[PDB]
Amino acid sequence: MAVEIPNKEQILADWEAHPMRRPRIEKVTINIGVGESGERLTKAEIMLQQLTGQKPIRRKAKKTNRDFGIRRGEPIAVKVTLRGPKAYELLKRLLAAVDNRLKASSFDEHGNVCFGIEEHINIPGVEYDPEIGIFGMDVCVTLERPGFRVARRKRKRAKIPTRHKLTKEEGMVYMMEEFGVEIVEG
Amino acid sequence: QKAHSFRRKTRKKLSKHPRRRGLPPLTRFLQEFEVGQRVHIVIEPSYHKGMPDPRFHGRTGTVVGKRGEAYIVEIKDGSKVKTLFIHPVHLRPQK
Amino acid sequence: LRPAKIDRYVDKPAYTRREYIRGAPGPKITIFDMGNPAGDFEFEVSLHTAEPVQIRQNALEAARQQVNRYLQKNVGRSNYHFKIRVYPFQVLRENPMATGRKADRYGNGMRRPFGKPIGLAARLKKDQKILSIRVNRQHLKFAIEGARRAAMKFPCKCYYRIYDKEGN
Amino acid sequence: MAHGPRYRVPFRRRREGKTNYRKRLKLLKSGKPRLVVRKSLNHHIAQIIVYDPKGDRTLVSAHTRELIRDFGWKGHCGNTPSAYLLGLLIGYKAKQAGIEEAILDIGLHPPVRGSSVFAVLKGAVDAGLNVPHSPEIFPDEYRIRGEHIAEYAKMLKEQDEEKFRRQFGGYLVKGLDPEKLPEHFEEVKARIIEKFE
RNA sequence: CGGCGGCCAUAGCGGGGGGGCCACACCCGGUCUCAUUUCGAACCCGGAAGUUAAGCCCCCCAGCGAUCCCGGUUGUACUGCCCUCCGAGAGGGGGCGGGAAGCCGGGGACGCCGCCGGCCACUAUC
RNA sequence: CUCAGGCGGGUCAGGAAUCCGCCGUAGAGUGCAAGGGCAAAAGCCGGCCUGACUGGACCCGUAACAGAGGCGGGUCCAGC
RNA sequence: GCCGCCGUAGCUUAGCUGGUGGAGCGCCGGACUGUUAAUCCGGCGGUCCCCGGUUCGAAUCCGGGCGGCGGCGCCA
């Protein structure tokens, strides 16, 4: 077969050298950017906070537009950025929520993935939900290497080769390893 | 020439090559000149402050002393003796 | 279109740069390449300019036509490739004046003598290639005749002539 | 500049991600020496540097590996109190080179209290160097002495797991400082002045 | 192999190898000093259990950019001075004094330089 | 603290605002013409703050050289 | 050749700070009427002349263009 086999072989290979070659999951950002705010502050805004377990941030609009971003500065969206065990706790369930055989057509060129599902999301009695039940989301998972942090800080910020940039192969197997399966073709 | 500001027809003196672009190195700014010393006055395009009138560019005068941070340089523009107040940035030692 | 007595000189300066100036004229030329691609031949004949001039947009279209017409009819467009490389860029200027007589001027010295656009011209120096036609050695005699016909409508003259490149 | 001959000239330090040429020109303008305090993950350096066109000259150095010899320091080289005794150590050589006035070059990094850069400056002012400052910047007492840490270390502790707090990861794994004792700090601080009393 | 520079692409892009990596990084705790309209990501207090894999240093390769050189085009393009010197003009030529790009071919170039530290060392090196 | 624009993943009829990653030496932006200046900024964001302060000079421009009023500016020093 | 001013539903005309769009007329479908006219309900189409630009967006504000309206085309 193919897709799965070539990916896996390289990651084992990365392990052999020592496993600081392998990637990590930097963060999970759960967002509603499809919007259901309007001029107001949405009540989808709580539902995310309870779900994630920590504070959300409003997202102000820009410009003058037909459907959303009608007036400049109005709430449109909400997001929370997850790191640490909170992010992982979200993924184990979230990955199951998306339909298994995780699509290799929804990967980024960096070995990253965004999920699209709206109005689903498990774990009762948190989702059900009386009396406010209106929601929609888009969930991104950013994946990168561990040794990348130097660029991020002030000290020693310089260009990072592509020999140390995450690629499409590593990200498919790494997601699979944690939970769920990947789509295999052939 | 149409019109008579300082900046007229100084497109060229006032412009740096694309390579030279970017905020200018700090050494040239710090530079120290002694009196009796002859300095060349050349506008650095990248540094806004310390500038002389651009017509003067290419001139060689003598530093007579200083006012504040700037230096006061004596030059003769045609017949007239003139004082040009210029920072060290736009000055270079002769020789 | 006044007779050409200014398109015959290059001692007149540049006023090309159509973006820059307010008011620019259209072309008359649209067709510049004709026949088969230029990779299917071996030999190159050029007409070489020996005199500096400005060559009018009108002259370019006329000269090309009379030439290309002859090549097309006799040879067919299954053979030869003919190119006139130049595009005219140099904008041309006019002082307003017509008959009106009597108490009227027309005119006028200044009060804006500065051009309204007549046209466009291409600047041709010494050893430029005004025409390049590509041919085989069967089709030699046609290409030379066509070039002779070109040369008259050249504003001054040729003196380097009908030139065998040979095809290097 | 990028791949062709396009706008801007890059610089050496600009490529590395180091000190801003603009910040360093402002500092240099007065004609005063720079007391260069710079950071590393387990080191601290202070240096009194002047400018030349040749490239800088450092009049005297003082470092954490010339403090971990023969000053009774056998503490962690990356903590805030090491930096306290770095200021003191370059404080004996401002009395044998006699230049006592310098201004703090932190390089790039935001100036907020609680940081290492204020702690070494604090050590220098007590050594008896006269450097320009406004006092509203010095770490708290807890931080200098090193006693925030003894209390922290009892909270955690690695290589003991329980439902009581015995949390895992760094706490001072080391035997020679279980938890770090402010008595130790005071011995080495007694080296103060050039007399070493 | 640290820190601070000078010159400021000859030190732009890209790739291979080795580490003689206590020091440098990742990394791990983040209560506290402290950074986020959200998150230790950022900023900062704390540590080293683990990693050389980057990074980093060191060795080296030029396909792309740029730097320099020789030769070829080329003393050609262009040009100051003089001309009862030529050309109907447009323009040219001689003498006299100077001389560019773009390109080919063959090459140097994937840095150089100043201060100070530091296991080791007391020397020169990662 | 770093951008126009482009790429791949997301939402949509498309698209917007919004989202994640990657490219990206300046095409953005800087009130307003044009030109010039600038990327760890003068741009972007945030906080604080009100020196668009008082006094009195040098110098330049105006008006090259070269007399020339009003006006502007750089550049000091004292005071707040 | 100069200097003002237009074009907006098939026509003619209101209108505009740049966030709009009508009136009368014609026309079309019903309805009075015996039929029809008149009359009487129901309607709709407008890139608001072309073509650039600024703007977050131009029917509107600037550039240019095209056709149509006035005013000079002379003391010399």
Protein CA at C116 to nucleotide C1' at G71, angstroms: 25
Contact D108 A154 (CB under 8 A): yes
Query: What is the DSSP pairing of strand C90-91 with strand C120-124?
Result: antiparallel
Name beta bridge partners: D38. Answer: D45
Q: Which residues of chain D from 73 to 132 reach within 8 Å of chain A, CB to CB? A: 108-109
CA dist A42 and A134 (Å) reads 10
Solved using: cryo-EM
- Listed in sequence order, the residues at least 6 apart from C10 whose beta carbon sits closer than 8 Å to its beta carbon are C52, C53, C54, C123, C125
A152 at the D interface (CB within 8 A)? no
Is A177 strand, coil or helix? helix
Q: What angle in degrees, to the nearest 10, is found between the helix axes of A168-178 and A85-97?
A: 90
Name beta bridge partners: A136. Answer: none
Protein CA at A27 to nucleotide C1' at E99, angstroms: 65
Return the number of other C-beta atoms located less than 10 Å from residue A9's C-beta: 12
- Listed in sequence order, the residues at least 6 apart from C11 whose beta carbon sits closer than 8 Å to its beta carbon are none
Extended strands (E) in chain C: 33-35, 43-49, 53-56, 81-83, 90-91, 120-124, 128-135, 162-164
Tokens of D53: 């066109």
Contact A158 D17 (CB under 8 A): yes
A149 at the D interface (CB within 8 A)? no
Do B43 and B14 touch, CB atoms closer than 8 A?
Answer: yes
CA dist D84 and D192 (Å) reads 11
**Cα Rg of chain C (Å, integer):** 19
B/D touch flag: 3 or more CB pairs below 8 Å: yes
CA distances from A138 to A34, A114, A123 (A): 8, 7, 18
Q: Looking at this protein, which amino acid is placed at residue C86?
A: V
A: neighbours with 3+ CB pairs under 8 Å? D
Task: Tell me which DSSP letter residue A107 carries.
Answer: B
* Chain G nucleotides covered by protein, CB below 7 Å: 1-2, 19, 56-57, 63-65, 73-76
Task: Tell me which DSSP letter residue A182 carries.
Answer: B
CA distances from A51 to A81, A94, A107, A140, A180 (A): 12, 11, 25, 16, 21
DSSP letter for each residue of chain D: -TTTT-S----HHHHHT---HHHHHHHHTT-PPEEEEEE-SS-EEEEEEE--SSS-EEEEEEESTTTSSSSS--S-TTSHHHHHTHHHHTSSSSSSS-----EEE--SS---TTSHHHHHHHHHHHHT------SS-S--HHHHHT-HHHHHHHH--SS---SSS---S-S---SSSSS--HHHHHHHHTT-TTTT-
Helix (H) or strand (E) holding A45: helix A44-52
Nearest to B18 among D7, D21, D53 (CB): D7
Tokens of C48: 């070489």
Residues 108-127 of D, Cβ under 7 A from nucleic strand E: 109-110, 112-116
